[PDB]
């Protein structure tokens, strides 16, 4: 008697993976609860990351292109910039959704307990209350609950990474201070080049400041097919001043006049660089070696992921871990899945992760999306490789929408001809993919795809062009193989 | 001696079937020629048709959507509006393309006879040479060419339906005059609700015209399922004074004034209406019977078409016949299908146009896009269908997007469960049916589609969250069938 409770299932953290996982084993009538310790639900997907991120590009995206329809004789002057209501937009639309999400586990019976969740033994979670309202600002009530359950999903995601370096100063911020929109910087460091930060940096060049990205490796959007950052890169360059790569960010030292930050490389101005802001997109840590995992047995990296299988069950078989914990790469949609396998596992049915491709996108302008093999990939493994471009140049629908530079690349296996990767530089490259994602768990072939009638004019088509190029059979392009 | 020529094919129109089937009989080795009347192949969809229409849709949709973005503090005034710059934007898409087809038959070498073609008899085409510039507009030359063929791939296309009773004048356009830009009208009555109007109509009230849309038929978009015209009639409901349907336009009768039209039906003004302009946009009509085809022996129906077998075979062995001319849906996708298959027995190889679906697109605000099996043809083959809806309500993206109020729609077969039809109301949707459009094609079930990881947050992913539901598995709705 004071606070104990038993469930068959406790998700220990309501993001993506959590929730999904939660709501699914609770579908399966299971008595299941959520430890969150914010009083949001959606993690940091739904509160400060994917979808304000991307209600943010979203309006930068229309005022790019309202200076585009100029030259069509469509003519706008500079919009006025409100950011107070810019800010309280996205703030609207997540609230809209993490109010949903609340809404759906009191309709599923879930339990949410608000509290930071600690293993205690392999069967007991000790949760220290916590109090506040505000994603990311909660506070521990002194108060503590013992949870007992059959099994444990843990979804305790990630958290941005922090440089040790890097001193602190309300001018220096990570993507959830991004996120806040406490004003346009006219200056804005970007450290490290990944999507995040690029994704971050769109927004703030298109609402007005100069960026520099500093980026330790040999480009941008590492991971994705150098081909398709060609592309984007060279439709953004006109928005930094400097596009650092292969260097390294060695002072950052703020001043009364702003933060002053030196870097060592090349084409690294050797001048110690002043911004009014510097924005740390330098990666994100699981945070397996915070939840006293050692407590109920399970084992984690020192990296602090918690390896897992195909069953999403960790050495601990009642103990099952999925999303951003478990490994890369860390996005909603690989959470969202594992998150099912592992609560179907809890329900006694033997689920597996089986898909065999997952989805990676940049949701900048253009976006840069790809899936399964890539030529890099490819050739690191060494597979033999078919690959199909088609420019977006011979698109009717993307000259007229006047994205033509772009293009679509399906990649086959070079022994089965069977699709293995997909790739596309373009807006809504994100919204396509998926065809290319079908494709390959279908297992399908250039024929397949090829022979499908996609309909005219649209970005679309692509992918059913860039097959028939695999068959060298595109009469919309000069002829292939003579 | 004089003008006489022979050749292995012979396409009889440079549209998106035809030079389709020019370029790829051409692939094979053959010696082809196109004979084209004006001198710009692309036929109807280049020229004056899918890309002129939807690059003007797509700048309408731009100023659509700054209209919106204000309450998001993103502040425009009205757009200054350059209809000679407009104009010519849309005149730049298309040369552009024009010019590279041309190009492209060039390096083919196939031969562009620009010139009438008549049959004189099963291996003779009359050609009364034609000049020229500007598509439709082009005028006989008195002089005439024989040309000879192993085979003929006659691909005449359709024409627009004039409505008998309506007079002419400057102010009563099909849609290649719309396509003009000669001006705004105040006032555009639209006679027919179907896609291409519909698109008309859309760009011309975002350029400012008040339209009158008159339907003979129960409601718009005759052909995709209601449910999906219900989001677009009520997001676009407001750019309309009346939306007469189940009306007859009886009289239509020009006055100094503007056109004045009186139309018969119910909730139809007893009053005769004034417009400044009135679109015909009643419906095409094949040209089979415009070809002298009985002097081949081809056989034409009475409606015009060329009936035609799974190999674009006529009842003439040697003499095919592909798009609009053969039958709806008259698409440019469907004639650059048919265009291939066509081309490939003329090469001696046997293909069978065997695509089982073709994808239909209104390019709309939001777009209506739909694929196979629809509610209506189920209810009518009284097909058992399992139809799977996802609302974008709850989806991430789209309530970022502002487009929540679209969604997904799979049907599947309810004895196999296999996908059989796709329905996508929102922005996009014709990039994203081609994956219910490959799903259909390899005969893939819920599990399937379900299980691939479609990318979050996006808009695409709702092919995914439509297949969970399908399953009974989607968490980010409500439970299913608890
Ligand atoms: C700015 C930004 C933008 C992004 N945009 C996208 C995108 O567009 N698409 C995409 O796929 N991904 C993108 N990501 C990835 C990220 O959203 C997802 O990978 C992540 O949400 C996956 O879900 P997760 O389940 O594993 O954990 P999380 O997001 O990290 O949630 C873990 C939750 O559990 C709670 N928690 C943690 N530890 C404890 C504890 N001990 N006790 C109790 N509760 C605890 C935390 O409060 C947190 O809410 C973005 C990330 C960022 C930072
Ligand atoms: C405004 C409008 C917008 C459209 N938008 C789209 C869209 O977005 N997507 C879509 O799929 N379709 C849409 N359509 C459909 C239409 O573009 C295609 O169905 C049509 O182009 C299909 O190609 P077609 O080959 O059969 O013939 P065509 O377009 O009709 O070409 C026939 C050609 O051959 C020439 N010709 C005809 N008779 C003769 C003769 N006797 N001698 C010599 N040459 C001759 C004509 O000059 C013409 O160029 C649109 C149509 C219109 C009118």
């Known amino acids: 008697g004071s606070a104990d409770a038993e469930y068959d299932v406790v998700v220990l953290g309501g993001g993506p993976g959590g929730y999904s996982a939660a709501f699914a084993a609770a579908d399966e009538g299971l008595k299941v609860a959520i430890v969150e310790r914010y009083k949001t639900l959606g993690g ?9 991120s991307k209600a943010l590009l979203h309006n930068a995206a229309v005022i790019d292109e309202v200076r585009h329809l ?20 996205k703030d609207g639309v997540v609230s809209r ?42 506070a521990p009530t002194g108060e503590k609950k013992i949870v007992a359950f059959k099994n444990c999903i843990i979804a305790a995601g990630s958290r941005v990474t922090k440089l040790p370096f890097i001193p602190e100063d309300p001018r220096i911020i990570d993507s959830s201070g991004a996120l806040a929109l406490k004003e346009v910087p006219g200056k804005l460091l970007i450290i490290g080049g990944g999507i995040i930060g690029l994704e971050m940096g769109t927004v703030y060049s ?7 990205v500093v980026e330790m490796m040999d480009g941008l959007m590492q991971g994705a097919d150098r081909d398709l950052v060609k592309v984007w890169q060279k439709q953004n360059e006109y928005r930094f001043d400097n596009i650092m790569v292969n260097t390294k960010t060695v002072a950052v030292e703020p001043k009364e006049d ?20 510097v924005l740390v997109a330098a990666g994100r840590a699981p945070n397996g070696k915070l939840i006293s995992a050692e407590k109920a047995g399970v084992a984690v990296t020192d990296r602090g992921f918690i390896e897992v299988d195909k069953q999403m069950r960790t050495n601990v078989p009642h103990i099952y871990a999925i ?13 969202v899945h594992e998150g099912h396998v592992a609560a179907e596992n809890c329900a006694g049915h033997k689920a597996y992760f089986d898909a065999r491709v997952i989805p990676g996108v940049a949701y900048t302008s253009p976006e840069v999306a790809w899936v399964g093999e890539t030529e890099l990939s490819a050739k690191a493994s060494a597979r033999k490789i078919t690959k199909a471009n088609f420019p977006w ?29 997909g790739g596309i530089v373009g807006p809504n490259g994100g919204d396509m993919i998926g065809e290319v994602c079908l494709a390959i768990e279908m297992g399908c072939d250039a024929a397949d795809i090829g022979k499908t009638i996609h309909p005219h004019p649209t970005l679309g088509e692509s992918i059913g062009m860039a097959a028939e190029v695999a068959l060298g059979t595109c009469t919309d392009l000069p002829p292939q193989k003579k």
Chains 1, 2 share one sequence.
């Not at 100029?70 to 937009?89: F, S, V, W």
């Not at 609402?207 to 520099?212: N, Y």
């Open 44 to 52: 940091v997907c739904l509160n400060v990351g994917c979808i304000p």
């Open 70 to 89: 100029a030259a069509n004789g469509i003519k706008y002057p500079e919009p006025e910039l409100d950011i107070d209501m810019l800010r309280a937009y």
């Open 97 to 138: 959704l993490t109010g949903g999400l609340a809404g759906m586990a009191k309709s599923r019976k879930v339990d949410v307990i608000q509290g930071d969740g600690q293993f205690l033994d392999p069967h007991h979670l000790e949760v220290s209350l916590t109090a506040g309202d505000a994603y990311e600002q909660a």
């Open 206 to 212: 298109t609402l007005g400041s100069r960026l520099d």
């Open 258 to 277: 702003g933060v002053y930050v030196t870097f060592e490389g090349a084409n690294a101005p050797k001048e110690p660089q002043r911004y009014d802001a």
């Open 323 to 335: 999303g951003d914990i478990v490994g890369q790469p860390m996005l909603a949609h690989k959470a």
């Open 393 to 421: 140049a011979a698109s009717g629908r993307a000259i007229a929408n006047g994205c033509d530079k772009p293009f679509t690349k399906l990649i086959f296996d070079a022994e089965t001809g069977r699709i293995i990767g």
